[PDB]
Amino acid sequence: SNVPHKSSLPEGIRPGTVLRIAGLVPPNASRFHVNLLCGEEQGSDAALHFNPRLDTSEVVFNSKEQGSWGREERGPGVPFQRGQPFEVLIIASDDGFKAVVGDAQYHHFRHRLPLARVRLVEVGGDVQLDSVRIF
Amino acid sequence: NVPHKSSLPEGIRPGTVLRIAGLVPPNASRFHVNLLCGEEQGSDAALHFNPRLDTSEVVFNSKEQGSWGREERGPGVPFQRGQPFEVLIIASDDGFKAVVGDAQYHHFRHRLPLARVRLVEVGGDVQLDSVRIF
């Protein structure tokens, strides 16, 4: 199932970076996450926390800075389903992160931390990961 | 087979993603994807992505004022006759990242300004499934 899955980004990511995450949402999944982290330590700051919640039918976006979570943003409905595969694109621009789900633009999350702080991508939770690619 | 045209109303910026899904015909010679700066014939091409299956090469190039540039070539041909493909053209601040399949294939540094791009054009021997701008 390959979780928790970590992808190190020693030189960071620039505007024009695409994170492609594919996987299956297992039959009794509660929630999973894709984190863009500043370091490898526990509780590391997070430029992006992408959190589909199957049990509450929401998709939460947040950030973590100086150990404190920001204010949650929510996307429109849950474009994931228990027992169904998915494809997510997280696209970094100069202005924020574009979340694409199932070939449809889903939500835009404005930068709160500098994009230059990102050093790691972490995928975890109730997800059976197909692949994580970083272009 | 008139080329497919898709206008870019707000141009493209670092973070624009062009997903081109399609199928190569069994008798295909070559097809191309152009990022053009105007809707006139002979407009500047900020990016000319040209896979060539008749000679087994993939050529990158630019064009301004009707004059081309120096060709760049990628490793082999990640395209086969009769086989489908998915291409990502990702604009960064440094250039265009071309992705074929699940791997970055080439990095074409910006020869022309990114803000001058206004039209995507797909032509040649190719069956076009979908053109998406993200």
Swiss-Prot record, chain B:
GO terms for biological process: apoptotic process; heterophilic cell-cell adhesion via plasma membrane cell adhesion molecules. The keyword Lipoprotein does not apply. It is found in: Cytoplasm; Nucleus; Secreted. Pfam families: Gal-bind_lectin. Its main location: cytoplasm. Induction: By p53/TP53. Monomer. Could be involved in cell-cell and/or cell-matrix interactions necessary for normal growth control. Pro-apoptotic protein that functions intracellularly upstream of JNK activation and cytochrome c release. This is Galectin-7. The gene is LGALS7.
